[PDB]
Structures are given as C-alpha cells and as structure tokens.
C-alpha cells in the first residue's frame, strides 16, 4: 500500500537551502517563503522536529530572515551546513537515526525543486522514508524545472501534497485540542494568494 | 490488477460535507452541487446506498438545500455528523461492515478535495475499498488544491472518474431495463455546462 | 515490466462506434475520423485485422462514410452491432479467441473516450490484453471527459499512444519492404493538422 | 525501488538522430540543440561515453553542425548510422556490451520523442537499463507528440528528467573537483531561454 498517512508523532519537517542569494531568481519565491513559514509555524503547533539545511553558506548566505525568526521559537531545530546537494548527509542521517528513529514521514520544503529537493527525496526514499513534497513550498529558477521535479519525484514514490493538505492531514480531527489554533494559522495563511494557482 | 470496474450491487455513494457556509467560497461549487445531485439521482435509479456526512454542523451549517432535498427520496440513506476530517468515523464504518460488507466500491463526491475527500479516500483504501473520485463532483477553495488532491489520491490508487463515466460504468449495457430512465438523467445533466471544463 | 511493444503479427485494430449521430456532438470530431482512417489504412499495409462496432446502429446510425469507404479494401474486417457499452461482447470475444488468439495487443480508436472506449479498455485488460489507446483517434462530447478518460485508462495500465507513434512502432525498420508505402501514409496524414495539437 | 539515481561511472549519454532535415520541422529545435550540447559537454566533464546515431544519414543528412562541432571536443564518442528506428541496433548494443557492460544508466536526448527516442527507451528498458529522458533535450514535429511520448515513456518506467536536474545529480556534491567547471556550464545553460517553458 502507498497511502502516505501523516501522524504528528511520526513526522518531521525538512527545509532545504532557502538562502538569500536565491532571492529574486527563484520562480514565485514569495509563495515559497510564505508557505515554508506556515509549515514551520505548524511544526511548533504539532511538536514537529525541523531539520534546516544550507548549501555552501559561506558564499551563498544563510537562511532568509523570514524563516530564521520563525525558527527561534521551535523546540527541536537543528541546522546543518552541507555541500552535498542532498540533505541526507551522514550528520543529518545520524540525527534522524539517533534522536528520532520512529519518525519515517518527512515533509519536504525548500529550493531548488530539481536539485536539492529532488536529491534529498530520492535518498530519503532509498532509506525507507515516506517523502511528502509540499508543492506549495518548493520551486526552482524556472517553472519548467519545478513542474518536472514534482512529477519526477512522484514517479519514484513521493507523495505530492500542499501546505493546507499536509497540515489538515496532521490535524486529522477538528475536535482535537490544537484545531482552534490550527484554524487561525490556516486562516492567516489564506490571506496571501498562492503564486502557483494559475 | 487495478481495473476499477463498477457494479451497482457492490457500489456505494459517499457525499462529503457539501455544507452551506462553503457557498460562494468553493471553486465552481455550483458544478459540485449539480454533479453530486446527478450522482444521488443516479443512486436512486441503480439502488445504490448513500452515506452523507456533515463536518461540525453547528458552525459550517447543514448540507446545502439542493442536495438535502434530493436526498429525501432515496431508499437507503443515513446522514452522519462528524468532527474527524475523514468520513470513516466508527459510526460510519459500523454501517458499512454490519449493513453492506459486500459493497467495496465507493463513489466519492464532496468538498474539500484536499481535506475531507482526501482523508476519506486514504482511509477507505486502507480498508481494502475501491475509491472512485468523481472528479467533476469534488472541489476546494482554490483550483490549485483541487488539482493537487486529485493526483494525490490517484497516486495512492484511487480511480479518477467523472459523473458520466461512472454512471455509464454502472449501467454497463443499453439493453438493461433501467437504461431508459438513466438516459433521461444524463440528458438533463447535460443541460448545464461543466465549470471545470476549460 | 510494462513496455507496450507493438508487433504486427500480434496486433489488432479496434474501432469504437464512430457513427453519424456523433457528427455534431464530439469534441474535435474531424481529427477523430481522420486519425482513425489513418489507422485503418495502416492496418491494410501491415496486415492487421480490424474489429469495428456500432452502438445501437438501428437508431444511432452506421459508421461514418469516410471510414466505411476505407474499410472496403481491408482484408480482415468484422463489424458487430451491440448494446453493451464495452466492445468485448461475447460474439466479439469469440472472434478473438477462435480466430486470432496470438494477437494480444489492441489498438484502440473511437468514441466516446469515457464511456465505450474506457469500458472496452477495462474489459480487455481484464483478459490479459495490452491496450494501446490511440489518443489521436479518441474523444468525447467534452474535452473534460476525454482528458479524464485518457488518464483513467492509463492508471489501469493502458498505453496512451498516438497515430504516428503506434504506426512507427509497428513499422520497426526503415529498411523493411513496408517502409516506403508507410511513409506515403504518414506524409498524407500530416497534411491536415492535428486538432489536438494546441 | 524506482529511484533512478545517476552515477557518472555507470552512466552513458545517447543523442538520437538530430539531423539536418528536421531543421524547421521539429518543434522548438533550437532548445533541443542547446540542451543536447549542454549534455554533451557535461559528458566530457564527467567522463561519460557518448553514443550518437543518424537515421538514413545519406538522405536525411548528418548531425547538425552545432552538435557536430561540440562532439569534436569529447574523446569518448561513437557515431553510428542506422535504419532501425530504435538506437539499440546490434552495432550499438555490441559497443555497450563489449566496452561498457557496467554502465546501465542512459541519458536520452534527440528527436523524435515518439519515434526514435521512444523505441530506444523501450528497447533499453527491456534490456534492464535505467532510461532517463532529458525532457529539455527531446522534441517531435508537433508539441502534441512530444508531450504524449514523455508520459508514454514515464508510464513504462523511464525517468523524466531535465538537463539541469540530470547534471546536478550526476555531480552529486559541490565539493567535487569538477564542480567549478560544471557550475560554469550550468551558468551558461541557465542563460538560454527554455522553448518548452510556457
């Protein structure tokens, strides 16, 4: 079975290579940034660990300030500086195996869809993880490479979801104690248009 | 094999959360209401049981009047009030197992594609059901989440059909004695356009 | 493995209900007639048996004159009248089993994609046939139900091909004794534009 | 697992029949030429063998001068003339078997998507190869047939990739010694508009 159920206690958020250099070059970057912050804010509300990564941070900068300020509150965040395109460096793999072996569901955000996101996805699939690509929160230099990467990841087994669909999947019940604050986050997230909804 | 054949003896119609508060907010909701009503009228002709659900009725309202009026005439209908996003709440599942264990094909209509339709679809597939998503009878607040959700369900095994394709599948032969009145239903259904046809 | 190779010795062309009633109801109908006629012409050059059907011919009319004229010179044709939406009526299925059991690759053309083409495709896949849907030569009353049906069939394993692609698969080698006449057919086919190429 | 990892040591580049008569006939031919040249240069940098074919070369012409001149810089190139539409002629297959049996990943470029690229991909899949179609670097006479063939090949197990995505996963790591010249190659490639990005 390939169902891609999402449980808060079995899930972890991945944010890939959202640097300041790629500002002004990524297709629909404001949507990518706004959507990723909604995921991060959701990660706090359902106690999801967050793994954040930077690619050649020396000559490409750090994570953009919009998400960096959001990440301060989150209880469990570890930031990895890498130069492998895939996020699954031995340090990240050890983090997942040593501190959260029961979490086999990865919610994947970041850029570029067809470079770091894709390679992270395939390595995660190789290691037996369920990969959930948040299509709202991934993009590339061109729209062509974003749409291609989504389908290329899909044909390898990755579930392609959205910010709202993933979050309501993790909520699973409006009668849960967290639903009221989940709804506020969703309502606030809807106040900005989706740049990919063409 | 993954054929998605539809037999009236082993089929059942699900109507998810088509409620008043979504009037004027959901993408092409009138097409959703009209297509769902055709499916409900079709279930009367082919004697399909109907399961209807409402999500937090005291805030989102009851089922829209057009569908609730059409549900008056159906022989086998039960309406459930629920807080879980998925329709497979224990009261609904108790109905399926204790009343119709032989019906393992679910025709799914309603809103939203990416929240309650999706989670119903995943849970139904978990229990060995065949899920046929009536694509022109499901929708979301944005077209983006609708299209994403349809492919997200198809990637898990759900069959993506339409009102005409699914109804003609159930009929299976124009020589059957029910085809004369099924034809009348299709002809009336075609008097209005498809809001998703662009 | 699902390669969908096409060999003339094991292939047969199916033409589904291209009748006069639809000359006024079907999206991109002229392309459907033209592409189907190219398939019939190719069936003659490659010695492919052809199975044609009519749905309720007493009321819906016979095959369109453009195709019926082209069928006169075809060596192996058998035309069946049916009320069942699927083309795989017992009389048809007897013809395949008794007279050409070695041919398990079916080239599928006709209308409508979502009713009679799809139900034929599902029944053929049930009996172990490889189904090649000629997307160039199938359509519905609406573009929505054609595109839906194409993916709905592919999701079950049907190979979605085109008039040029299927023909050139069968004409494996340009050094074959058939290539010169096959080229004359393709150049004639390309003289009138593919209406689906939008 | 259908991951489709790409390793330079086990990968080979195929260029299908980019000849001199298809100028003015192939949809977005300039993009196909530029994308293939980027692949050819990447093969040189990553020490990937290159196999080029021409179909009926005497009457269809040689490989286009843009790609022909670039092949002058690559040491490991083999150019063959063929009558068979598929690239897997015995001469080409013997070159693979007796000179690089360890390379079972193929990056596929050229024209036409639905005739020569497709049949090459099907034959390669039949022989246990991973086929990666560089969607950036394939096209047909019509947009319709290229789009069809891409999904017709993905449906059979081929990975649908792009020039940038395939190259970056071949490089695997930004700390590799060849990354600097690869980044220059990618930088030049990003400056050319994508004819299929619309």
Q: Which residues, other chains included, contact A188 with Cβ-Cβ below 8 Å and sequence gap of 6+? A: none
User: Which residue in B148, B151, B153, B154 has the most chain A C-beta atoms within 10 A of its own C-beta, making it the best mutation to test that interface?
Assistant: B148
d(CA A195, CA D64): 40
| Helix ranges, B47-178 (H) | 57-60, 65-70, 90-99, 118-126, 143-154, 163-171
Tokens 């291209």 correspond to what residue?
A: C18
d(CA A136, CA A114): 15
d(CA C143, CA C132): 20
Tell me if A114 and D172 make a contact (CB, 8 A cut-off).
no
Tokens 């039960």 correspond to what residue?
A: B78
Contact present, A38 and A163 (Cβ < 8 Å): yes
Rounded (to 5) percent helix, strand, coil in chain A: 45, 20, 35
Tell me if B160 and C151 make a contact (CB, 8 A cut-off).
yes
Closest-CA distance of chain D to residue C11, Å: 17
d(CA D116, CA D110): 8
Q: How far is CA D151 from the centre of its chain?
A: 17
User: Which residue in A148, A149, A150 has the most chain D C-beta atoms within 10 A of its own C-beta, making it the best mutation to test that interface?
Assistant: A148
d(CA D26, CA D11): 27
Tell me if C160 and D148 make a contact (CB, 8 A cut-off).
yes
Residues of D in contact with C173 (CB under 8 A): 83-85
| Helix ranges, A73-194 (H) | 90-99, 118-126, 143-154, 163-171, 179-189
First to last CA, chain B: 32
CB atoms within 10 A of CB C83: 13
Q: Report the sign of the C-alpha dihedral through residues C94, C95, C101, C105, in that order.
A: negative
Query: What single string gives the DSSP state of each residue in A70-91?
Result: HHTT-SSEEEEEE-BSSS--HH
How is residue D162 written in tokens?
A: 């792009």
Q: Pick the closest to residue A21 from A83, A63, A68, A72 (CA basis).
A: A63
Helices then strands, counting H and E runs in chain B, come out as: 8, 6
Contact present, D72 and D30 (Cβ < 8 Å): no
Chains A and C make contact, 3+ CB pairs within 8 Å: no
d(CA C159, CA D144): 16
Q: Pick the closest to residue B132 from B12, B9, B8 (CA basis).
A: B12
Contact present, C132 and C161 (Cβ < 8 Å): yes
d(CA C17, CA D81): 43
C-alpha distances in Å from residue A58, one per residue of C43, C133, D137: 64, 54, 34
CB atoms within 10 A of CB D25: 13
Rounded to 5°, the CA angle D126-D128-D130 comes to 105
Tell me if D173 and A83 make a contact (CB, 8 A cut-off).
yes
d(CA D75, CA D26): 29
C118-126 and B163-171 helices, crossing angle to 10°: 60
Phi, psi of D9 (to 5 degrees): -70, -25
Tell me if C83 and B173 make a contact (CB, 8 A cut-off).
yes
In this complex, the residue of C135, C165, C173 whose CB is nearest that of residue D118 is C165
Technique employed here was: X-ray
Question: In CATH, which superfamily holds the domain spanning B8-189?
Answer: Isochorismatase-like (3.40.50.850)
Tell me if D151 and C169 make a contact (CB, 8 A cut-off).
no
Catalytic residues of B: 17, 82, 116
Residues of C in contact with B162 (CB under 8 A): 114, 144-145, 148
Tokens 């690229």 correspond to what residue?
A: D117
Q: How far is CA C156 from the centre of its chain?
A: 18
Query: What single string gives the DSSP state of each residue in B146-196?
Result: HHHHHHHHHTTT-EEE-HHHHHHHHH-BTTSTTHHHHHHHHHHHTTS--TT
- Please, which residues bridge with residue C131 across strands? C106
Q: Which residues, other chains included, contact C197 with Cβ-Cβ below 8 Å and sequence gap of 6+? A: D142, D143, D144
d(CA A66, CA B153): 33
Residues of D in contact with C162 (CB under 8 A): 114, 144-145, 148-149
> Is omega for the bond preceding B133 within 30 degrees of 0, making it cis?
no
Closest-CA distance of chain A to residue B32, Å: 20
Phi, psi of B83 (to 5 degrees): -110, -30
Report chain breaks in chain C, C–N > 2.5 Å, as residues after which they occur.
none
Report resolution (Å) to 1 decimal: 2.3
Tell me the CATH number for domain D8-190: 3.40.50.850
Tell me if D122 and C162 make a contact (CB, 8 A cut-off).
no
Nearest-CA residue of chain D relative to C4?
A: D156
Contact present, B111 and B22 (Cβ < 8 Å): yes
Catalytic residues of A: 17, 82, 116
> Is omega for the bond preceding A53 within 30 degrees of 0, making it cis?
no
In this complex, the residue of B154, B162, B169 whose CB is nearest that of residue C119 is B169
d(CA A168, CA A39): 11
Q: How far is CA C78 from the centre of its chain?
A: 14
d(CA C129, CA C125): 5
d(CA B154, CA B169): 19
d(CA D112, CA D85): 10
């Amino acid at each position: 079975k390939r169902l891609g159920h999402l449980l808060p206690q079995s899930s972890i958020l991945f944010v890939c290579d959202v640097q300041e250099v790629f500002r002004g070059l990524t297709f629909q970057l404001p949507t990518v940034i706004h959507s990723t912050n909604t995921m991060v804010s959701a990660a706090k509300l359902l106690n999801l660990p967050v793994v954040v990564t930077t690619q050649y941070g020396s000559r490409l900068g750090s994570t953009v300030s919009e998400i960096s300020k959001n990440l301060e509150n989150v209880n469990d965040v570890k930031i990895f500086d890498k130069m492998k395109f895939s996020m699954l460096v031995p340090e990240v793999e050890h983090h997942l195996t040593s501190n959260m072996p029961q979490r086999k569901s990865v919610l994947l955000c970041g850029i570029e869809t067809h470079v770091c996101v894709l390679q992270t996805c395939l390595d995660l699939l190789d290691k037996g993880y369920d990969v959930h690509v948040v299509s709202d929160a991934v993009s590339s230099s061109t729209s062509y490479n974003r749409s291609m990467a989504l389908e290329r990841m899909r044909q390898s087994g990755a579930y392609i979801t959205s910010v709202e669909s993933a979050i309501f999947q993790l909520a699973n019940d409006a009668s849960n104690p967290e639903f009221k604050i989940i709804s506020k986050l969703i309502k606030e997230h809807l106040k900005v248009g989706n740049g990919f909804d063409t």
